[PDB]
Design an enzyme around this catalytic site. Structure first.
Site, short mmCIF file in Angstrom:
data_model
loop_
_atom_site.label_atom_id
_atom_site.label_comp_id
_atom_site.label_asym_id
_atom_site.label_seq_id
_atom_site.Cartn_x
_atom_site.Cartn_y
_atom_site.Cartn_z
N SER A 60 0.79 -1.23 0.00
CA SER A 60 0.00 0.00 0.00
C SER A 60 0.82 1.27 0.00
O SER A 60 0.23 2.35 -0.19
CB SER A 60 -0.97 -0.12 1.19
N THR A 121 -6.60 -16.07 5.11
CA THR A 121 -5.39 -15.47 4.55
C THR A 121 -4.78 -16.29 3.43
O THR A 121 -4.58 -15.80 2.30
CB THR A 121 -4.35 -15.23 5.68
N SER A 158 -9.85 1.90 2.37
CA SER A 158 -10.35 0.97 1.38
C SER A 158 -9.44 0.95 0.17
O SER A 158 -9.25 1.99 -0.49
CB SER A 158 -11.78 1.37 1.00
N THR A 297 2.62 3.21 5.12
CA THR A 297 2.86 1.80 5.38
C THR A 297 2.51 0.96 4.17
O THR A 297 1.78 1.40 3.28
CB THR A 297 2.02 1.35 6.58
O1 BSA Z 1 -4.64 -6.48 2.97
C1 BSA Z 1 -5.11 -7.54 3.29
N1 BSA Z 1 -4.28 -8.68 3.18
C2 BSA Z 1 -2.88 -8.53 2.82
C3 BSA Z 1 -1.94 -8.10 3.98
S1 BSA Z 1 -1.73 -9.36 5.20
O2 BSA Z 1 -1.03 -10.36 4.38
O3 BSA Z 1 -3.02 -9.73 5.69
O4 BSA Z 1 -0.93 -8.84 6.35
C4 BSA Z 1 -6.44 -7.80 3.89
C5 BSA Z 1 -7.50 -6.95 3.49
C6 BSA Z 1 -8.79 -7.07 3.99
C7 BSA Z 1 -9.05 -8.15 4.86
C8 BSA Z 1 -8.05 -9.02 5.26
C9 BSA Z 1 -6.75 -8.86 4.77
#
Ligand code: BSA
EC number: 3.4.16.4
Length: 345
Positions: A60, A121, A158, A297
């Site tokens: 991001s 995840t 978002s 970040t």
């Molecule tokens: O950005 C998201 N995932 C990538 C970063 S990480 O790998 O979860 O630290 C994420 C976005 C919305 C819900 C859950 C996860």
């Protein structure tokens, strides 16, 4: 500024390793004097050591690159921050009152589609990693849900907002985001380690591998290095290095990337919490010693980034741990900003 505290930085990286980061590293450019530290491995299977020259996925942090392009378009008279998104992209959004400024500051109400994608995840990563989405595909996924707040009414981070950003860039310029980033940012700043290769999955040159932490405590790490990042694009797909992110945020804060007027717009802070704000694709963090720093970040699978600079750009810091989905590591890595800006107790 206080002197950066390298002993403190060393302790941060060691703690991040103890919490599950295979490798962790940090570079400070302190007004022309470099600080650089790294611990652990770029590749945990081969044992190759991580180093501050390793390229990585900035996640991001990409939003700041997209914001710089949009703000240059404002300077050129091609974009009005208070115009409706739908003026430029007719019929895109359900509400004509949602403006460009609201999108860039996460005040649009647009639902974040990644909550659907990454509910789990590792399965979510496995679902998206080799997919190619259009910008419109991602907007449609968001719009399956209602907006979460009225236009401008509330901060709610978002990814959808910076998908809109990329669609706006490409429409208004007639060029790809890669071309615009190259011509407006990477080439002028000579960012030789910085790339936007979407949808290619290869990271050019020597790089840190990324290791996705599973949702199950103690589970085996997943190599998440190679993916399209098509789920994020102008919200998350830039590749860079610690040196190049330091160069970028120093150039931003020191006034080199847009007019003074547009940098001021970029720094109109929306409150996030009592020590943080969000501008236009830019974050503010207030440190314990009464210093604020400015940057972004990054999270993307297997990589956590912090990239922040002082208000005049004279000191910049970029820290990377090559894991993600590990809040202990994420929280620990934030401490690099304390050691680098606030110094020793
Ligand atoms: O950005 C998201 N995932 C990538 C970063 S990480 O790998 O979860 O630290 C994420 C976005 C919305 C819900 C859950 C996860």
């Amino acid at each position: 500024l206080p002197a950066p505290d390298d002993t403190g930085l060393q302790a941060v990286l060691h703690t991040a390793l103890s919490q599950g980061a295979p490798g962790a590293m940090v570079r400070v450019d302190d007004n022309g004097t470099i600080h650089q530290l790294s611990e652990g491995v770029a590749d945990r299977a081969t044992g190759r050591a991580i180093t501050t020259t390793d390229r990585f996925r900035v996640g991001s942090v990409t939003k700041s690159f997209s914001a710089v392009v949009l703000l240059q378009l404002v300077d050129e008279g091609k974009l009005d921050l208070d115009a409706s998104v739908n003026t430029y992209l007719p019929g895109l959004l359900p509400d004509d009152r949602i403006t460009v400024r609201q999108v860039m500051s996460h005040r649009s109400g647009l639902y974040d589609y990644t909550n659907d994608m990454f509910a789990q995840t590792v399965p979510g990563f496995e679902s998206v990693r080799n997919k190619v989405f259009s910008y419109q595909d991602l907007i449609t996924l968001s719009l399956k849900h209602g907006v979460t707040n009225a236009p401008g009414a509330a901060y709610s981070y978002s990814n959808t907002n910076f998908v809109v950003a990329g669609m706006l860039i490409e429409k208004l310029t007639g060029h790809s985001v890669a071309t615009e980033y190259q011509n407006r940012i990477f080439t002028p700043l000579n960012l030789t380690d910085t790339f936007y290769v979407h949808p290619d999955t290869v990271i050019p040159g020597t790089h840190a591998n990324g290791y996705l932490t599973p949702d199950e405590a103690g589970g085996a790490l997943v190599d998440s290095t190679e993916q399209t990042v098509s789920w994020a694009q102008s919200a998350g797909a830039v590749i860079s290095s610690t040196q190049d992110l330091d160069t970028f945020f120093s150039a931003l804060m020191s006034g080199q990337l847009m007019s003074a007027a547009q940098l001021a717009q970029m720094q109109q802070w929306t409150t996030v919490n009592s020590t943080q704000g969000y501008g236009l694709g830019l974050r503010r963090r207030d440190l314990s010693c009464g210093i604020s720093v400015y940057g972004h970040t990054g999270t993307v699978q297997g990589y956590y980034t912090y990239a922040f600079a002082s208000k005049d750009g004279k000191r910049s810091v970029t820290a990377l741990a090559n894991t993600s989905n590990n809040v202990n590591v994420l929280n620990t890595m934030a401490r690099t900003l304390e050691s680098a800006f606030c110094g020793k107790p």
